[PDB]
Amino acid sequence: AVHHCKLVFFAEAAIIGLMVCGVV
């Protein structure tokens, strides 16, 4: 099975990049 990742951004005041990965 394959891993998928994507960048998600959060406002904290900079904007923080976060990597979100799941197994599709």
Next chain:
Amino acid sequence: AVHHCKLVFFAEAAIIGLMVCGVV
């Protein structure tokens, strides 16, 4: 830098695991 990751779960049954990584 160093990546800090953690498991997050959405109990929706069927539980959806995801991994979230930010960089320090």
